Structure formats: structure tokens, C-alpha cells
Paper text:
Here we report the investigation of the role of protein flexibility in the modulation of binding kinetics and equilibrium thermodynamics of drug binding to heat shock protein 90 (HSP90). HSP90 is one of the most abundant proteins in the cytoplasm of eukaryotic cells, comprising 2–5% of cytosolic protein under non-stressed conditions. It is a ubiquitous molecular chaperone intimately involved in a variety of pathways, including cell signaling, proliferation and survival, and protein folding. The N-terminal domain of HSP90 (N-HSP90) contains the nucleotide-binding site, which has been the target site for drugs interfering with ATP binding and ATPase activity. The unbound N-HSP90 has a highly flexible lid segment comprising residues 107–14137.
For 7 of the 20 compounds, it was possible to obtain crystal structures of the complexes bound to N-HSP90 with loop-in and helical (8, 14, 16, 18, and 20) conformations of the α3-helix region (loop- and helix-binders, respectively). The main difference between the structures is the conformation of residues 104–111, which can adopt either helical or loop-in conformations. In complexes with compounds whose R1 substituent exceeds one atom (compounds 8, 14, 16, 18, and 20), these residues have the helical conformation with an adjacent hydrophobic pocket lined by the side chains of M98, L107, F138, Y139, V150, and W162. Steric clashes between the ligands and residues 105–107 would prohibit these complexes from existing in a loop-in conformation. All ligands occupy the ADP-binding site and form typical interactions, which include hydrogen bonds of the 2-hydroxyl group of the resorcinol ring with the side chain of D93 and with a water molecule that generally mediates interactions with G97. In contrast, for the helix-binding compounds, there is a large favorable entropic contribution to binding, and most of them have a binding enthalpy penalty. This switch in thermodynamic profile is thus directly related to the conformation of the α-helix3 region with compensating differences in enthalpy and entropy of about 60 kJ mol−1 between loop-in and helix-binders. Protein flexibility is another possible contributor to favorable binding entropy. As previously mentioned, the N-HSP90 crystal structures show higher B-factors for residues 103–111 in the helical conformation, suggesting greater structural flexibility of this region compared to the loop-in conformation. In the helical structures, however, the Q23-N106 interaction is not possible due to the binding site rearrangement, and this may contribute to enhanced flexibility of the helical conformation of the α-helix3 region. on can vary significantly, indicating transition state destabilization playing a role in prolongation of residence time. Helix-binders reach up to 230-fold slower association rates, when compared to loop-binders, indicating a higher transition state energy barrier for helix-binders, as depicted in the right-hand panel of Fig. 6.
Numbering used by the authors:
A (entry chain A), B (entry chain A): 16 to 223
């Protein structure tokens, strides 16, 4: 059922860098994930102009933010194009290798972790606030997969023998014990207001 | 040979806004075009991981900046994925309509023309410095096309019965009489240094 993969050397090095560097402006993770959601939503919206049958798996194009104080998780849901088994494993491993090298070269030359997105490696900023990340994704042309990683050099991929979602990506952030502020309504609102105000899709913050 | 199209109402309105608004920080056009080149280069690099035969039309992934004082043109060449007849006409017309609406709504609420890229309509900033724009593009799965526009509500598309380029996009900016500074070596270098320093591809400024 569950397949285990070692991260490429440079990616594993970037994650250790993000987990061990003292950096207080951790809030940047939300903008990076929202921006990735928005790009998946654009990818599906564009593919639907030439082939209107790609919106069969969901007509609605949006982003949902779901805090869960009990489970200590923050979930970012989108109905974007989603990702295939190949994207999760190979594709987002090969494209990452290039940008990871450039970003660490930049940080060496005194750059900021807040610049991570300029290198296409914005996802890894989730390890600033999360101890484990679970990604549930579904692309039209493949099955539903669960990607998971607590860093430490490896990630797992399995078929999601769980509740089905129509086309999209659901990112589950299992927060570190001291990062519970990102489960607070006014805090999420504050971050979204200052970093993701100009997103071309509706962003709905869920209440508890 | 030559097909003439009317721009969608909102796009034609955005171009009039950019051509008529007094705005001195015109230099932003270069970053917007370079960033679009870089995204075309990423699109081809990613499509080449799953299908290595897409790099048959050129192995090299780069951006070339070519000033021509005689012709009063600045050319931005890339070897990115390129664009089809459909992209030039329909696809980049429909996706633009959404972002154009959002950007003008933002500018009404006191936003800056320098924010144009956040709306995916960064291309139209070329009309800050250019009186006419010629786009020569070539995608693997279509022929070579020439797109042209001096704004004024219309653009032209024709098959390029000219010298063939392998996969990519070549943007030719016919500069306004008072925008010749963008043909100067030190000026282009200055703009590239401060706005496009973290591009994941080699940018070569051509000498004259
Ligand atoms: C496991 C993966 C590392 N992520 C959770 S992710 O990349 O941050 C991420 C990816 C997508 C996504 N779906 N389809 C698609 O193309 N993308 C995508 C978008 C932009 C860049 C790279 C990408 F693949 C998303 O909707 C949200 C995300 O948080
Ligand atoms: C006529 C068109 C309006 N442009 C000259 S452009 O969009 O600025 C522009 C487009 C491409 C391009 N080639 N393939 C591709 O997908 N793109 C693309 C990239 C990003 C966004 C939208 C896009 F189509 C490019 O390499 C350079 C550009 O200056």
C-alpha cells in the first residue's frame, strides 16, 4: 500500500535549513501555499477554455482555509488542477532541485527565507510551522493520492482509501506545539489581508 | 494572409489606461516580460521531464535582450514553450479579461501600475514604452505566428513567412521617440540587476 521515498539530497538540505534556522517571520508559509493554490486554479481554468469537460470534477474554483484546534491542524483546500502520482514523486522533485540550489546560494549571499517563492520552492516554508504535512490530491487523469512527510529525509505516497474529493489539492499542516497562533481566526485573517489580498479566487476562512 | 481582431472591451480599456496615465516608473515593463519568458522556459522544462522529445526544437533554455538603435527596437527573445494560434487569439484573451477587471478595480482603490503582474496582465505594461509590439512565437504543436498591435482596439495575426526560429517567443518593442533610454547598455543592466536578479535562466544582454 504505502511507498517510501528518499528526498533528493538538496531538498532534504533545504528542509533541515528551514526547520533549524532561527527565523521569527514564520507567517509567510500561508501566502506561499495560497499562491500555489491559485496557480493550480489558473492551470485548470486555462485547460477548461480548450476542453470544457475538465470542469466535470467540480465547476467551483476556490480556496478554503480550515483550522482545527482539536487536531491542531490547518488545512488549505483548493479545487485546482490537482496532481498526478508522477507530479508528487518525480516532476516536483526534479524542478525543485534547480530552485533549491539557487535559493541556498542566495541565502549564503545574505538573502531572506521570505524570498523562498521567487525560487519555486515556497512549499518547503510549511516546515516553519508544521511538524508533518499531508497532501491529498486528485487530478482528472489519475487517482486520488496521499503524500506525507515529517521531513527527516523521506516522504510517503499511497492511494487514498479515504473519503473522495473531486479534482484539487488539500494541504494538511500538523502544527508544531508553539505554532497554535495559526489556528486563531483574527491571526489567519491578518496574514491573508496583508499577503494574499490580490488572489483571483474566493478565499473562505472557516469558523469553528 | 493577415487576420485582424478586435481586443476584448476591458483589455482595450486597460491599454488606453496604460498609454494615457502619467506614470514615470516605466522601467517595470522589462521585469514583466522577463518573468513571462521565465514562466515559458519553466513550462517547456517541466513538459520535457515526462516527454524528452519536446527539446528537439532547441536544447538551450535562455533569455536574450537585443537593443537596436537604428530600428529603435528592444527585443526580448526566449526559447520557452512558445504559443499556438489559439493562445495568441482566444486563450490569452479570456484569461486576461478576469485579471484586467481586478487590476482596474485595484487602481480605482489607489493601487500602482507597478502591481500589474499580480493580476497576470503584465504584458500590457509594454505599451508604457512601445508604440507597436510584434510577437514572433513558435510552439512544437503549431506553426510560427506573428502577432502585432499598435493598440487602438485591434491586433493582427498572420503566419510568419519570415526566418524560422526554433521553439520560443521573440517580443519586439518599437519604442516611443522619448523612450530610447531602454536601448542604452547601462540602463538595461541597471533594470535587470534590480528587478530580475533571481531568474533561473541565463539572461544575455547583447552589445551593438
Ligand atoms: C505536494 C506539493 C509539494 N504541494 C503541496 S504544492 O506544490 O505546494 C501545491 C501544489 C498544488 C498544485 N496542484 N496542481 C498543481 O499544478 N499544483 C502546483 C501549483 C504550483 C506549483 C506547483 C504545483 F505542483 C496546489 O494546488 C497546492 C499546493 O500547495
Ligand atoms: C503575446 C503575449 C501577450 N505575450 C508576448 S506574453 O504573454 O507577454 C509572453 C508569453 C510567453 C509565453 N510563451 N509560452 C507561454 O506560455 N507564454 C506565457 C508565459 C507567461 C504568461 C502567459 C504566456 F502566454 C513568452 O515566452 C514571453 C512573453 O512575453
Amino acid at each position: 500500500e504505502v511507498e517510501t521515498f528518499a528526498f533528493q539530497a538538496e531538498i532534504a538540505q533545504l528542509m533541515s535549513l528551514i526547520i533549524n534556522t532561527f527565523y521569527s517571520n514564520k507567517e509567510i508559509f500561508l501566502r506561499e501555499l495560497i499562491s500555489n493554490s491559485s496557480d493550480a486554479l489558473d492551470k485548470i481554468r486555462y485547460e477548461s477554455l480548450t476542453d470544457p469537460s475538465k470542469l466535470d470534477s467540480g465547476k467551483e474554483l476556490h480556496i478554503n482555509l480550515i483550522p482545527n484546534k482539536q487536531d491542531r491542524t490547518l488545512t488549505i483546500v483548493d479545487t485546482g488542477i490537482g496532481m498526478t502520482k508522477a507530479d508528487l514523486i518525480n516532476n516536483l522533485g526534479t524542478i525543485a532541485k534547480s530552485g533549491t540550489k539557487a535559493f541556498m546560494e542566495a541565502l549564503q549571499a545574505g538573502a531572506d527565507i521570505s524570498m523562498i517563492g521567487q525560487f519555486g520552492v515556497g512549499f518547503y516554508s510549511a516546515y516553519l510551522v508544521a511538524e508533518k504535512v499531508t497532501v491529498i490530491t486528485k487530478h482528472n487523469d489519475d487517482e486520488q493520492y496521499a503524500w506525507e512527510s515529517s521531513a527527516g529525509g523521506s516522504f510517503t505516497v499511497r492511494t487514498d482509501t479515504g473519503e473522495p474529493m473531486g479534482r484539487g489539492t488539500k494541504v494538511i499542516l500538523h502544527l508544531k506545539e508553539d505554532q497554535t497562533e495559526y489556528l486563531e481566526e483574527r491571526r489567519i485573517k491578518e496574514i491573508v489581508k496583508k499577503h494574499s489580498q490580490f488572489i483571483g479566487y474566493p478565499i473562505t476562512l472557516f469558523v469553528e
